[PDB]
Write an enzyme that holds these catalytic residues in place. Structure first.
Site, PDB file in Angstrom:
ATOM      1  N   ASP A 508     -40.004  58.431  70.004  1.00 30.78           N
ATOM      2  CA  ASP A 508     -40.980  58.767  71.036  1.00 30.78           C
ATOM      3  C   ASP A 508     -42.284  59.180  70.362  1.00 30.78           C
ATOM      4  O   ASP A 508     -42.268  59.850  69.329  1.00 30.78           O
ATOM      5  CB  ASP A 508     -40.472  59.910  71.920  1.00 30.78           C
ATOM      6  CG  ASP A 508     -41.348  60.133  73.160  1.00 30.78           C
ATOM      7  OD1 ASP A 508     -41.149  59.431  74.181  1.00 30.78           O
ATOM      8  OD2 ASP A 508     -42.231  61.024  73.134  1.00 30.78           O
ATOM      9  N   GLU A 786     -40.886  52.918  72.934  1.00 30.79           N
ATOM     10  CA  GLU A 786     -40.912  52.987  74.360  1.00 30.79           C
ATOM     11  C   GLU A 786     -41.980  52.006  74.861  1.00 30.79           C
ATOM     12  O   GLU A 786     -42.780  51.476  74.104  1.00 30.79           O
ATOM     13  CB  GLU A 786     -41.106  54.423  74.852  1.00 30.79           C
ATOM     14  CG  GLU A 786     -41.791  55.412  73.906  1.00 30.79           C
ATOM     15  CD  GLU A 786     -42.668  56.444  74.629  1.00 30.79           C
ATOM     16  OE1 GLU A 786     -43.411  57.173  73.927  1.00 30.79           O
ATOM     17  OE2 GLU A 786     -42.650  56.526  75.888  1.00 30.79           O
ATOM     18  N   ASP A 883     -39.754  66.410  73.456  1.00 33.47           N
ATOM     19  CA  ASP A 883     -39.938  65.033  72.981  1.00 33.47           C
ATOM     20  C   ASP A 883     -38.714  64.507  72.226  1.00 33.47           C
ATOM     21  O   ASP A 883     -38.576  63.295  72.027  1.00 33.47           O
ATOM     22  CB  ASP A 883     -41.220  64.898  72.143  1.00 33.47           C
ATOM     23  CG  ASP A 883     -42.487  64.744  73.017  1.00 33.47           C
ATOM     24  OD1 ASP A 883     -42.366  64.717  74.269  1.00 33.47           O
ATOM     25  OD2 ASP A 883     -43.607  64.648  72.454  1.00 33.47           O
TER      26      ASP A 883
END
Length: 1011
Positions: A508, A786, A883
Site C-alpha cells: 500500500d 493497488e 496502512d
RNA sequence: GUCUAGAGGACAGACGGGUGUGCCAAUGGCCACUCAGGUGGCAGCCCGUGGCACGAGAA
C-alpha cells in the site's frame, strides 16, 4: 529486459572527430527530413496540422505538391509514357503510403522489414499485394521514386565510395527506416488523440443529454451570468447548500443587504472554505432564479458540466506534425551491435586502462580543414562510470556478450549489447553551431534466469492471471495444490528461492510511510500449518482449497529516508518554511488591497471592509516589518476613506500598493538568495534520520516554492508595476528541472525499495562503515499493487491522501515496478483497492481511523490507525495499524476472489411491480452475475431489501452518478459482511458510514465516563 | 506501558587520481539589456568518515 546505459565520450583530444559527430547528426536529420517529407507528402491525403492549431497544408496542397514531384520524377528518368492520369497516379501514392506505413490503416508493420524490402525498388535504378504497386510504379516511370540521400546533392559530405552495384549506403537504410518508424508512431498517435476528442465530445454530450432535459433557459442564464462576471463556476460555490437554504427565507423583490448578510454568516461558519463572495453576491440579484427555481441542484450539477466542457476546450483534435530538425526536433544517429547489418560499434573493455573503456565505431565520420570525409575505425574514450563497472564480458571472441551483474541481488545475469544512439543535451543543441558534451546511449539486453533456463514464462505465471496492462490479478485456484508439490518449501532465501515456494507481497502507498508491505505464504492447512513457534499464525482461507490457506509471514513499513519523525527534526522542518509561510500570507493580503482598487463596484466595498477592521491584519504569521508597513498604509487608507473622491481613492491604492510590493521584493530577493546558494548542513554517508527528501513533504516543499514564484510574479503583471509580453520561456528553469529529478529519483528508489523486499533482501548498516544488502527471507513471486482513480470515492481515504502527487506517485511506481521487476522474474499485479482502509481483515467490519494524523490516547481523526467492531456489538473493538491493514486487505481480496459487488452497489429508481425499487447498475459481472434480476426495496428509505424476479467508463461512471445523487435519481448502497453494522442489510451509503461513526464514536466518547 | 501483524513491529518516553545521469537540507557566482522570471557575454565535489538509486525514446 532492455536497459539503456548512456555514456559520455571524452571526445577531447580529437576535434577532428567532434565536428564529425556534429556533421553526422545534422546529416542524419536531413536524411530523415528528406524521406519523412516524402511520406507526409506521400499520402495523397491528408491535411497536415501544425500549431503556432493551424493546418500547414491542406488536403489538396499535399496532392498538388506531390504530383509536381512525381511528374518531375518521370521527366528525370526518361519516360516515353504513359504518364498516368493525375487522379490514378494519386491512388498509387496512397496505396504506397499504406504499405510504407501499415499503421495508417490500423494494421501492423516492421520498419526493419519494410525498410529492407522497399528502399531498393524505391530509391534505386536497379542497374548499377505490394508487387502490384511496384510493377505499377515502374510502368509509370517512377523507379527509382526518390533520391538516395547520401549519394546526393543534399549531402555536403564525402562518404566512402559506392561499389558492387549497390546504390544504397548503410545510412540511406537507417534514415529510411527511421522515417517509417517515426510515421508509424505518429499515425497511431494522431488516431488516438483524434479519437479521445470525439469520446470527450460524445461522453460530455451524454451529461448534456441526461442532465439538462429541456431546460435550456437556465443554461443560457448562467452563460449570461458568467459574461456578466467577466464584463469589467467550478467548485468555488462551496456554501451553496447553506447559503441557498437560508436565502429561501428571504424574498425576491427584497433588499440585497439582507442577502449579503447571509453570505457573511456562512463565511464564518465555513471559513476557511467558501466560494467567492462575488459568485454568491452575483447570485443575489434577480438572477437568483438559478438557485431560486428548482432545481436548486443545478449550479452544483452545472459546475461539473463546466469541468467537462473545459477539457474538450483544452484538448486537441489532431496530433500536430513537425519534421525533424537537427536543432529544433532532433533525432539521433543510430548504430548496431556488432553483427547485424548497417553501421556497427564495439565496446572495448579496459582499452585505455582499468575501468577505462572505449567505443570503436566502424564507420564514424570526420571533418578536416572544413572538408568532411568519412573514416573507417575510430575509438573514443569514455568517462568512467559506476554503471559501466557493473557489466562484464563473457566471451572475448564473440564481443557483445556481457555478464550484467547485480550484487545482492545474488544473481549474475547474462546478456548482450544492443545498438546505440549518439546524443547530447537538448539545451546545447541550439548552441552547437564549440565543445558541447556528447553521450552514447547503449541498449543492453539482459536475460532473466527464467529466460536463460529456456522457459518461455516462469513456472508460477501459470497460477496467476494478470490483465489489462494495468495488470489485474486473479489466482488460479485448482493449480495451487499441483504447484506446491512440484515446487515445495525451501530454506532458500535469496533470488535463489524463487522456484521453491509460493508467496505474494501486497504493498500500500501512503504519504507518511512510502510503502506498507504484507507477505503471505501458501501452505496446507492441517499439515505443519499448526506448527508455529509460540503462537499460531494468522491466515486467510483460499477459495480453491480446504487444506490450502494463506499463512502470513511478516508485515512491515518501508520508509524512504525522509519519513522519520522527531522533536529535533520537526523543529528544523518548520524553520525551513517559516519565511515561505509568511511570504504567502503577506501576498494574500497584498492581493487583497489590490481588490480595494475595484474598479468594478461591490468588490471595492466588500474587500475594503474585511481588510481594515475585521478582525484585523493577521499578526500570527506575518513577517513583522511588513506587519508595520501594512498597518501604516492601512491607517492611511482609512483616513481618506470618506474624504477622497473615487479617483483620489482608486489611484491612492495603486500608489499605496506599490509601497508594500517594493518592500516584499527585498524579502523575496533576500530569501531566494539564501535558498539558492547558502550554507546548510548537508549529510555525509548514511544518516538514519534526515530531513526532507525522498518524502512527499520534501517534494511538496520544492513545488510550493515554484508555485509561489509563479504567483509573486503573476501578481505584478495583473496589478502593480510590471507590464510585459510573455515570451515562451517558463519560470524557474533551474527549479523545474530540480523538482522533476527529485521526483524521478523518488519513485525509482521506491521501486527498488519495494523490489528488494520481494526478493527479501534487507539493507543492514553495520559497519556503515559499509551497509550492504544481505538476503533475509525467501522471495515472493507476485507483487500486489493497488488500483488507481479517477474517481475519488466518498468515505475511502481522506483527500489528504489524494492529491496530484499521490496520483502521480501511484502511476510512477507501477510503471517503474513493472520495469524494474522484469530482470528477475517477479510478476507485478494490482487489486481493486476501494475501502481497503475502511474495512477490517478479517472480522471484517467497517471502521474509522484514529488517533493522530500531555500524552494523547484514543482520539479520532483521519489517520493513522484503524479500529473496528468485532463479533460483535460490544462485543469488543479491535485495533490495527492503518496502512498495514489496507495491505492485508489486498491479500484477502486476492485469495477470496473479491468483487466490489459484494460491498457496494450503484442503483437508481425505477418501478417493477407497481412498486418503486432501486434497480442496479449491472456493469459488469461479477455484479451482473450476482444481481441481474434482483431488485431492492425499502420501507424506511434507509435500509434496503433485495427481492427476486457495453461501455464501462468507470472514470465517467461516478461523474454521471454523483449528479444523479444531487437529484434523487441514483442511490448507493453499501453493506457489511460481518452483519455487525445494520444486521448486514444493504443500507443507503451515507447512513451506513454515520452508523459506523456513531458505533465507535459513541463507545469512545462514553468510555470517558465521569468528568 | 498500550495495540495485533508476532515482526527491521507500530505508538510513548601538501601531493596524486577521477567527474555517466540525478537525488540526499543538494534550486551555482559576477556584470550588462527588458522584486519574480527570462535573454546575452566572461571566469566546485569525489577518491587514495560518503551514501543512495538509474532504461531509455516521444509528446
Amino acid at each position: 529486459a532492455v536497459k539503456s546505459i548512456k555514456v559520455k565520450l571524452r571526445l577531447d583530444d580529437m576535434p577532428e572527430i567532434r565536428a564529425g559527430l556534429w556533421k553526422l547528426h545534422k546529416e542524419v536529420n536531413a536524411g530523415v527530413r528528406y524521406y519523412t517529407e516524402w511520406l507526409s507528402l506521400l499520402r495523397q491525403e491528408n491535411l497536415y496540422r501544425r500549431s503556432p492549431q493551424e493546418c500547414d497544408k491542406t488536403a489538396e496542397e499535399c496532392k498538388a505538391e506531390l504530383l509536381e514531384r512525381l511528374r518531375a520524377r518521370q521527366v528525370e528518368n526518361g519516360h516515353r509514357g504513359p504518364a498516368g492520369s493525375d487522379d490514378e497516379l494519386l491512388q498509387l501514392a496512397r496505396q504506397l503510403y499504406e504499405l510504407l506505413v501499415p499503421q495508417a490503416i490500423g494494421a501492423k508493420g516492421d520498419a526493419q522489414q519494410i525498410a529492407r524490402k522497399f528502399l531498393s525498388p524505391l530509391a534505386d535504378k536497379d542497374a548499377v499485394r505490394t508487387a502490384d504497386v511496384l510493377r505499377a510504379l515502374a510502368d509509370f516511370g517512377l523507379k527509382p521514386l526518390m533520391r538516395v540521400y547520401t549519394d546526393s546533392e543534399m549531402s555536403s559530405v564525402e562518404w566512402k565510395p559506392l561499389r558492387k552495384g549497390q546504390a544504397v549506403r548503410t545510412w540511406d537504410r537507417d534514415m529510411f527506416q527511421q522515417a517509417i518508424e517515426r510515421m508509424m508512431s505518429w499515425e497511431s498517435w494522431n488516431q488516438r488523440v483524434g479519437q479521445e476528442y470525439a469520446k470527450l465530445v460524445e461522453q460530455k454530450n451524454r451529461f448534456e443529454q441526461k442532465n439538462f432535459v429541456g431546460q435550456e433557459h437556465l443554461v443560457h442564464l448562467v452563460n449570461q451570468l458568467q459574461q456578466d462576471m467577466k464584463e469589467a463556476t467550478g467548485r468555488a460555490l462551496r456554501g451553496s447548500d447553506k447559503v441557498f437554504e437560508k436565502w429561501g427565507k428571504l424574498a425576491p423583490d427584497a433588499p440585497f443587504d439582507l442577502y449579503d448578510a447571509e453570505i457573511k454568516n456562512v463565511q464564518r461558519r465555513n471559513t476557511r472554505r467558501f466560494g467567492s463572495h462575488d459568485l454568491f453576491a452575483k447570485l443575489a440579484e434577480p438572477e437568483y432564479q438559478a438557485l431560486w427555481r428548482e432545481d436548486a441542484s443545478f449550479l452544483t450539477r452545472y459546475a461539473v458540466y463546466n469541468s467537462i466542457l473545459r477539457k474538450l476546450n483544452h484538448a486537441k483534435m489532431f496530433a500536430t506534425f513537425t519534421l525533424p530538425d537537427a536543432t529544433a526536433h532532433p533525432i539521433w544517429t543510430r548504430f548496431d551491435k556488432l553483427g547485424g547489418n548497417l553501421h556497427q560499434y564495439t565496446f572495448l573493455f579496459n582499452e585505455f586502462g582499468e575501468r577505462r573503456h572505449a567505443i570503436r565505431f566502424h564507420k564514424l565520420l570526420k571533418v578536416e580543414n572544413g572538408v568532411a570525409r568519412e573514416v573507417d575505425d575510430v575509438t573514443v574514450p569514455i568517462s568512467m562510470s559506476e554503471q559501466l563497472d557493473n557489466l562484464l564480458p563473457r566471451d572475448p571472441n564473440e564481443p557483445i556478450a556481457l555478464y550484467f551483474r547485480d550484487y545482492g541481488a545474488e544473481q549474475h545475469f547474462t546478456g548482450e549489447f544492443g545498438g546505440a544512439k549518439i546524443q547530447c543535451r537538448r539545451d546545447q543543441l541550439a548552441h552547437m553551431h564549440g565543445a558541447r558534451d556528447v553521450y552514447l546511449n547503449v541498449s543492453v539486453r539482459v536475460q532473466s534466469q527464467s529466460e536463460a533456463r529456456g522457459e518461455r514464462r516462469p513456472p508460477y505465471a501459470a497460477v496467476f492471471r494478470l490483465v489489462g496492462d494495468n495488470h489485474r490479478a486473479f489466482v488460479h485456484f485448482d493449480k495451487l495444490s499441483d504447484y506446491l508439490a512440484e515446487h515445495p518449501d525451501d530454506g532458500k532465501l535469496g533470488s535463489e528461492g524463487l522456484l521453491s515456494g509460493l508467496r505474494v507481497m501486497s504493498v500500500d502507498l501512503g504519504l507518511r510511510t512510502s510503502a506498507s508491505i504484507s507477505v503471505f505464504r501458501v501452505a496446507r492447512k492441517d499439515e505443519l500449518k499448526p506448527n508455529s513457534k509460540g503462537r499460531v499464525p494468522f491466515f486467510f482461507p483460499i477459495k480453491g482449497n480446504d487444506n490450502l490457506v494463506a499463512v502470513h509471514e511478516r508485515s512491515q513499513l518501508l520508509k524512504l529516508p525522509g519519513e522519520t519523525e522527531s522533536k529535533d527534526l520537526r523543529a528544523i522542518r518548520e524553520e525551513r518554511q517559516r519565511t515561505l509561510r509568511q511570504l504567502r500570507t503577506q501576498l494574500a493580503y497584498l492581493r487583497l488591497l489590490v481588490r480595494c482598487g475595484s474598479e468594478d463596484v461591490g468588490r471595492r466595498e466588500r474587500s475594503w471592509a474585511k481588510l481594515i477592521e475585521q478582525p484585523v491584519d493577521a499578526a500570527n504569521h506575518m513577517t513583522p516589518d511588513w506587519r508595520e508597513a501594512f498597518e501604516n498604509e492601512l491607517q492611511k487608507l482609512k483616513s481618506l476613506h470618506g474624504i477622497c473622491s473615487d479617483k483620489e481613492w482608486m489611484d491612492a491604492v495603486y500608489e499605496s500598493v506599490r509601497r508594500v510590493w517594493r518592500h516584499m521584493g527585498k524579502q523575496v530577493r533576500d530569501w531566494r538568495k539564501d535558498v539558492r546558494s547558502g550554507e546548510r548542513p548537508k549529510i555525509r554517508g548514511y544518516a538514519k534520520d534526515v530531513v526532507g527528501g525522498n518524502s512527499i513533504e520534501q517534494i511538496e516543499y520544492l513545488e510550493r516554492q515554484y508555485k509561489f514564484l509563479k504567483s509573486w510574479s503573476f501578481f505584478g503583471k495583473v496589478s502593480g508595476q510590471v507590464i510585459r509580453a510573455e515570451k515562451g520561456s517558463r519560470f524557474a528553469i533551474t527549479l523545474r528541472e530540480h523538482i522533476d529529478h527529485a521526483k524521478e529519483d523518488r519513485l525509482k528508489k521506491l521501486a527498488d525499495r519495494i523490489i528488494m523486499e520481494a526478493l527479501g533482501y534487507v539493507y543492514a548498516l553495520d559497519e556503515r562503515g559499509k551497509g550492504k544488502w544481505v538476503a533475509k527471507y525467501p522471495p515472493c513471486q507476485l507483487i500486489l499493487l493497488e488500483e488507481l482513480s479517477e474517481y475519488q470515492f466518498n468515505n475511502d481515504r481522506p483527500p489528504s491522501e489524494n492529491n496530484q502527487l499521490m496520483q502521480w506517485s501511484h502511476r510512477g511506481v507501477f510503471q517503474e515496478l513493472i520495469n524494474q521487476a522484469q530482470v528477475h522474474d517477479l510478476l507485478v499485479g494490482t487489486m481493486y483497492a476501494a475501502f481497503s482502509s475502511r474495512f477490517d481483515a478479517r472480522t471484517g467490519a467497517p471502521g474509522i481511523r484514529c488517533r493522530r494524523v500531555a500524552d494523547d490516547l484514543i482520539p479520532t481523526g483521519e489517520g493513522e490507525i484503524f479500529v473496528s467492531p468485532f463479533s460483535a456489538e460490544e462485543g469488543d473493538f479491535h485495533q490495527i495499524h492503518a496502512d498495514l491493514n489496507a495491505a492485508q486487505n489486498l491479500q484477502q481480496r486476492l485469495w477470496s476472489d473479491f468483487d466490489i459487488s459484494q460491498i457496494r452497489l450503484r442503483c437508481d429508481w425505477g418501478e417493477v411491480d407497481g412498486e418503486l425499487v432501486l434497480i442496479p447498475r449491472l456493469t459488469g459481472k461479477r455484479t451482473a452475475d450476482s444481481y441481474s434480476n434482483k431488485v431492492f426495496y425499502t420501507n424506511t428509505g434507509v435500509t434496503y431489501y433485495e427481492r427476486e424476479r457495453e461501455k464501462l467508463s468507470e472514470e465517467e461512471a461516478e461523474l454521471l452518478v454523483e449528479a444523479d445523487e444531487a437529484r434523487e435519481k441514483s442511490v448507493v448502497l453499501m453493506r457489511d459482511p460481518s452483519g455487525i453494522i445494520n444486521r448486514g442489510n444493504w443500507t443507503r451509503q451515507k447512513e451506513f458510514w454515520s452508523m459506523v461513526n456513531q458505533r465507535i464514536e459513541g463507545y469512545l466518547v462514553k468510555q470517558i465516563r465521569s468528568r
